[PDB]
């Protein structure tokens, strides 16, 4: 009774809040710049922060500056001093967000990108113009202009690439994560601190952290808070009237109602935070691989080009031409737009994540997530629709003799704890019985005998006010009932019957609990049992299937018995229908008379009934085999394992702490959701690969094509048509992105260790490239011309290049899928349009010199295809092993079986540890 | 007595019904189209189904629409409402069949075939004409016409290939499988639901499923049915008078007589079925291999051809000629007719299956069946002509003291159960004795002590009305009689004698049973024993031999003792005459004091006396060694193993459930039948291979032959003669099919894993091809001509091609057999006719330019042979191992022997578990 009523009152807020990606659009289109009437040197800004936090109080001629007193002095007595009252004006929120945002300061830095590549290229184009204007009397008519023209195009791209990511961040404001309950609807609601604009009513309780500077309104008796983080002395502060909740810690003392006054840089624990962040160095893995490649491209290009220059005096051209050939080759080569391209994908990709009841923060975590190999997920609420709620309690006939009801009511324990509707069933159940009351919600409990391995069961010695004595027991069915006595003697029937039912229940699920009652635990008095099961669902059942197809290993952690656990595992699809005892479905039991379960635990999934300080070792041990992991928080006992791991997945309706030591959040408290996530991540990588291959492969051909002519051929490379290819080939194309549907059909990629653009990929580019590169020389380099002066060679040398690259860019679609054309709609649209430029470029202007347009053009198409087919093969891959490797496998047979049998043997002893012991 | 009389009455229908493949011919020649006065959009049709099933009742102006009330509401009370009466008019059956057919909706889909190949080719021919008519002023006289002409021919083939399969399905109506008993003959008869046309009297009993909407006539007291499948609530329905049997489940409550009213799409559980089937994706293995190859041909051809085009500017021909060379090469290459060819074989092949008292459904199961490696078949009724009927019961002298007759009568158990004539023998036997009565059929049995391993025997405590007490025992001879006491003391003689006889019986078969009688089982009183044996037969004894020659492993599951089992095994041929104890013949005994038999079971065949929940593991374990399987249903306990397996073979006179979790049925309840099946399956594959080799091999030569000329030679390729070869070579030929007699001499093929057109086969085509390809260049490319203008080169270049390909197509006969000409009669007929075209094509028209006709023609014959010989060698294959591989084998000797001995040792203990125990 009086327990819950108090639980119900203080909670409930069904819809996080269906509040669109709008407010962001409006806000972001005025962010970074504009108002803020103070534009001092950045230097003074930092100093101001370190001078504000604490320090005495000078006049600023502005409303504000009360947050400083928070981390400079107690602020106990004076807090009521400062005084309270304040709300926003919708306006303040838009600005505060832009400067404070996510009440923790994050550093955004460039590992160089912007400078070493950024405007290092920009200068080249500038000196190009310089050279252009330097040549007074030069016989080159408008070359200076052309280069200037091209350089402009390159830039256009420059700015474009850099612009979208900025606006993207503005649109991230106003989301819904955790830490901050406010009053909006008809009930208190939860919302993000950043969104938690000043004004909305927040509610701080025990153990919670202040999402923002809040002016206390009232509540519980005493309100204690730890201001250490800000000031000093770990001594809790007694906030008196119209108090103030900066961001300190609520030392589980009292509860408070409040209004958010400060919510940004102007924040209390947002002032001692958001305005003081000296620097440091630290990079991500893949970023390392990327940087590494950038270099291997940096030198590779800048060298091959140099060659195309000095090895051309043989071609009979002044080193000058060769010079502007190497430099020219440099420009094309320079795979630019990488920072912008992966930042856009990161930002956008993270939006969709956020868009699907799965809130993910820090784009630096996507990398890892994409490489997830194992997913350890809790059952109730995540995997199963049924919280850990046993609806099938069951007790035999009756007796009604006093303590009879006591035992039945108390020892209806369970697994988890926290309440549900499961207990209510018990409440009403009692009612069914006599008519009395409470029994359910109640009792005076002081001592708890920790569940010891031998007897296999927990118990608690409780004493009613005026009563005899009672001790309620819970634990495994078998062992518990082995004791049992109960009012009337333990008849055979009663026994047999009890078992059978539990068995019946647990062979298709059901999570059996054994309840008796004695005083110490020795005594025997079986009351009943309360099993459970749970309809999996929509995307979990399929998501699991996807997991296997993706290689990803999913482990379930539940508070159900191994028997049932295996049943659930089998039900979902984890473990098919095959009853194990080896690991799959069955697994192990972090049990005492099952200890040896640490071998069963690591049964590659199923884990049922485990303890603390072992999480630690389990992660260590699992990692020792290079098993990555996506875990789900819980208690302090799992903290070490959490930190050890790499990915932390916290439930939206869970704890924030966990969401910190992690890299994402579950709103859609569904399991199927994660498999989807893994899917996207995998999509992100392939696409990146396909994107790189196209760029590099296609670009490499131009590298030596330039070289070729450098030595032979005849025609030339010149601003005009060259600049064209450059614009249509090195721009958007290398850009493009799309999700690959099959991609969930590829094992997880190794990060840290695994080398960037894979060797095979390197092969893919060289292959496709080497074709078109050569296919250029013989495109017409055989063909047939009548006068020798390039009036056919050029018209195609350019038309072909433009067309091929087109081709390559379509061998860049999904890196996982093999053999797909006309995809990427936007990409295709570009192809046609791009092709159009080419046609016009050849039609009128050159309408009188076309010869290659009749049977040279067709040849393009006939070969504009081989590129697609080449990829189709690459994409489909099959490994070959020399018939001796598989043979060894022929041997693995037995010892494998033997091992299994052995495991089973002992695993057999563990089914009845006590009997065995007794027998011995 | 009163037991059987009631069994006899309710059964018997000797001939499934000798009803020909006629009615099908007539029906199918009007199916899909015609009447049905409503041709709405397919959209409305689906919606109509989901709107019918349940939903309120609008007017349609037609007789019908009563089936909807079945799955929309109880329909208990109202069922008598709707009312009953209705029969067909022969007409209705023909139509209902066409729309309903096999009261389960099957999806027929094309994985592309029809479109990506179908009319993708059709367009090419159309644009060919377009190009033809586009060239106004072209100097090519009638080329447009020629191509149009050819394209027509290609089509003719197009339609032809697609037409036969459609009509084939019409001819499948009217067959005899299971589920549906009707009154036609002088007794109730069984027939297929689809054939079960409205009108015929059906009889539904307990546990049966309603084959069709039936208007109940009457029968048993209460008739309960579960309408869940349709409506809701698992609560059985009490069908009152003139009831209705839609398709619900008969909850083993009552028996009913009825008349089938609705039998099609208009069906009750045919309405909630046959009109609602949203889609999905799922393909077969080999289909995967096929599709895979299609691609490898798709690209291969479309590429080599492209080459034959652009590498021909060297030949001195405008890219145009080379263009229509690549495209031309494309057409020939494109191994078309694959969908039609394998669909025809599938359909037809499945007809013959159905034609031979072996009913097989779903052409997607043939693939697997063909690859059957192991066949686990039950003895009685399948392998042996003798049902499990022991005719040699035998008891000693007499006593006549009361309970003496009791024991003898009751404990005459057996193995199986269900009745036979075996029991009748016992009935009459008793008669022989005094003259009394029943004893046989009777007794009051309530309790059954499950046969426990120690004592090795089952027993049942029965109590007559007014009598002392009695407990009948059955089980292994040895152990049972070890107890025995009986009226008069257990004399030595009596004992010794008893044994000897059983031994005598069981060393040439005989399935001994031990019968006593006590109360608990301790007591001893031997009554007698009832062995058995069984004449194998015609095709079983030979079929078994075929199995071995085919590699297929056959396992027998019987209810006879190991001793006898091995005898039967030896008798049949499974296990020769060599008494084992290792596995072959003897095998194992799913016995208690034989437990270790799980190693003997997997003795590679023989299994005698096994239990439930082990089927599960046995299949799992067997599969763990890549052992495929064709199994035979039975009980619920074998269900898991059945689902695990891949092929289910159910007896025609058996259960339907099994026939579901399977892929075929045994009408001819013979074992020999399966071996025949395996034979056909194997025939189907080879033929396919031979068919592919011919097509591909022969086609590849034309691929580069085109290329050759592209570079050199002189003559040309042109519509006329080219179109001819195309018509006679790419049509029927690639088509043809035949059964290979030896083919039962080849081990089973690996499906899923094994690669399609085998590498060796790839070699076979390339070999044969490479010959004729080259043999063309030197056919006359050496020969001797006087003027240089092709008047000899052409006349033969075409005549040869036509002749060779002829040759190749005969290297396509049975892929298993090696060295066979003039086979395939139809094929040969074609050869001659085809050859004729060639002769005329050369004779008159070209009568004045022939030079090659004298000694060029003979040369054809001399080499028109080497192709046959080449195959003959390929077909005969011998493996070579380096003399060290066999040596290891020299070592296997011992350890093999040692292992056997060891097995035997323990296997020796198992012959007398109890003695041993006692001694210990």
Curated annotation (Swiss-Prot), chains A, B:
Could you tell me where the Acidic residues compositional bias lies? 38-51
State its Enzyme Commission number(s).
7.1.2.1
* UniProt topological domain (Extracellular) ranges: 139-140, 315-321, 714-720, 780-806, 848-853
The UniProt entry lists the main location of this chain as membrane
* Gene Ontology biological process terms from the UniProt entry: proton export across plasma membrane; proton transmembrane transport; regulation of intracellular pH
Q: List the Cytoplasmic topological domains.
A: 1-115, 161-291, 355-687, 739-754, 879-920
Could you tell me which residues belong to the region Disordered? 1-77
The record's listing under Pfam families reads: Cation_ATPase_N (PF00690), E1-E2_ATPase (PF00122), Hydrolase (PF00702)
- Name of the protein this chain belongs to: Plasma membrane ATPase
- The scientific name of the source species is Neurospora crassa (strain ATCC 24698 / 74-OR23-1A / CBS 708.71 / DSM 1257 / FGSC 987)
């Amino acid at each position: 009774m009086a327990d819950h009523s108090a639980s119900g009152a203080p909670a409930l807020s069904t819809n996080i809040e269906s509040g669109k990606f709008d407010e962001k659009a409006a806000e972001a289109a005025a962010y970074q710049p504009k108002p803020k009437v103070e534009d001092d040197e950045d230097e003074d800004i930092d100093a101001l922060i370190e001078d504000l936090e604490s320090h005495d109080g000078h006049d600023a001629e502005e409303e504000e500056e009360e947050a400083t007193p928070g981390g400079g002095r107690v602020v106990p007595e004076d807090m009521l001093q400062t005084d309270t009252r304040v709300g926003l004006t919708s306006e303040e929120v838009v600005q505060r967000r832009r400067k404070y945002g996510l009440n923790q300061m994050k550093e955004e830095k460039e590992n160089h990108f912007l400078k070493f590549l950024g405007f290092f290229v920009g200068p080249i184009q500038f000196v190009m113009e310089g050279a252009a204007v330097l040549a007074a009397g030069l016989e080159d008519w408008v070359d200076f202009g052309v280069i200037c023209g091209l350089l402009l195009l390159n830039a256009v791209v420059g700015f474009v690439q850099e612009f979208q990511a900025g606006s993207i961040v503005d649109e991230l404001k106003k989301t819904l994560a955790l830490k901050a309950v406010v009053l909006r609807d008809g009930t208190l609601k939860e919302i993000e601190a950043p969104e938690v604009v000043p004004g909305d009513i927040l509610q701080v309780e025990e153990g919670t952290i202040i999402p923002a500077d809040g002016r206390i309104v009232t509540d519980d008796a005493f309100l204690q808070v730890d201001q250490s983080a800000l000031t000093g002395e770990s001594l809790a502060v007694d906030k008196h009237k119209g108090d103030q909740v900066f961001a300190s810690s609520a030392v589980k003392r009292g509860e408070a109602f409040v209004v958010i006054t400060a919510t940004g840089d102007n924040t209390f624990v947002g002032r001692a935070a958001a305005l003081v962040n000296a620097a440091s160095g630290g990079s991500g893995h893949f970023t390392e691989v990327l940087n590494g490649i950038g270099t291997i491209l940096l030198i590779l290009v800048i060298f091959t080009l140099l060659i195309v220059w000095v090895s051309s005096f043989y071609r009979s051209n002044p080193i000058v031409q060769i010079l502007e050939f190497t430099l020219a080759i440099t420009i094309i080569g320079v795979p630019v737009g990488l920072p912008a391209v992966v930042t856009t994908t990161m930002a956008v990709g993270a939006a969709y994540l956020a868009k699907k009841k799965a809130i993910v923060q820090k784009l630096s975590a996507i990398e890892s997530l994409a490489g997830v190999e194992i997913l350890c997920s809790d059952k109730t609420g995540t995997l199963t629709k049924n919280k850990l709620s046993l609806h099938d309690p069951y007790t035999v006939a009756g007796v009604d003799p006093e303590d009879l009801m006591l035992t039945a009511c108390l020892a209806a324990s369970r697994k988890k704890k926290g309440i549900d509707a499961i207990d209510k069933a018990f409440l009403k159940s009692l009612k069914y019985y006599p008519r009395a009351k409470s029994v359910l919600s109640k009792y005076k409990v002081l001592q708890f005998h920790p569940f010891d391995p031998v007897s296999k069961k927990v118990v608690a010695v409780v004493e009613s006010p005026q009563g005899e004595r009672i001790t309620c027991v819970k634990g495994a069915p078998l062992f518990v009932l082995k004791t049992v006595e109960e009012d009337h003697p333990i008849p055979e029937e009663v026994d047999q019957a009890y078992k059978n039912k539990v068995a019946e229940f647990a062979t298709r699920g059901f999570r059996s609990l054994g309840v008796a009652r004695k005083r110490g635990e020795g005594s025997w008095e079986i009351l009943g049992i309360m099993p459970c099961m749970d309809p999996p669902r929509h995307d979990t059942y399929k998501t699991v299937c996807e997991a296997k197809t993706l290689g990803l290993s999913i482990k379930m952690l539940t508070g159900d018995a191994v028997g049932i656990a295996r049943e659930t595992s089998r039900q979902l699809g984890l473990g098919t229908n095959i009853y194990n005892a080896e690991r799959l479905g069955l697994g192990g039991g972090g049990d005492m008379p099952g200890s040896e379960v640490y071998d069963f635990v690591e049964a590659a999934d199923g884990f049922a009934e485990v303890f603390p300080q072992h999480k630690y070792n389990v992660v260590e041990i699992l990692q020792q085999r290079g098993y990555l992991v996506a875990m789900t928080g819980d208690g302090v006992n799992d903290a070490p394992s959490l930190k050890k791991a790499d990915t932390g997945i916290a439930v939206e309706g869970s704890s924030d702490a966990a969401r910190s030591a992690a890299d994402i959040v579950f709103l859609a408290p569904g399991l199927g959701a994660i498999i989807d996530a893994l899917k996207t991540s995998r999509q992100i990588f392939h696409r990146m690969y396909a994107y790189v291959v196209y760029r590099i492969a296609l670009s490499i051909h131009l590298e030596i094509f330039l070289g070729l002519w450098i030595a032979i051929l005849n025609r030339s490379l010149n601003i005009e048509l060259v600049v064209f290819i450059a614009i249509f080939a090195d721009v958007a194309t290398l850009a493009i992105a799309y999700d690959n549907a099959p991609y969930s059909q590829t094992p997880v990629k190794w990060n840290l260790p695994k080398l960037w653009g894979m060797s095979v990929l390197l092969g893919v580019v060289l292959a496709v490239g080497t074709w078109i590169t050569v296919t250029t020389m013989y495109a017409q380099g055989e063909n047939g011309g009548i006068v020798q002066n390039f009036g056919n060679m050029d018209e195609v040398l350019f038309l072909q290049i433009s067309l091929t690259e087109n081709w390559l860019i379509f061998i860049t679609r999904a890196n996982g899928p093999f053999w797909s054309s006309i995809p990427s709609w936007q990409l295709s649209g570009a192809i046609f349009l791009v092709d159009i430029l080419a046609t016009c470029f050849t039609i009128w202007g050159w309408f009188e010199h076309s010869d290659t347009s009749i049977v040279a053009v067709v040849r393009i198409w006939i070969f504009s295809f081989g590129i697609f087919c080449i990829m189709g093969g690459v994409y489909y891959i099959l490994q070959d092993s020399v018939g001796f490797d598989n043979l060894m496998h022929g041997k693995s047979p037995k010892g494998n079986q033997k091992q299994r049998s052995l495991e089973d043997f002992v695993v057999s002893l563990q089914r009845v540890s006590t009997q065995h012991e007794k027998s011995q």
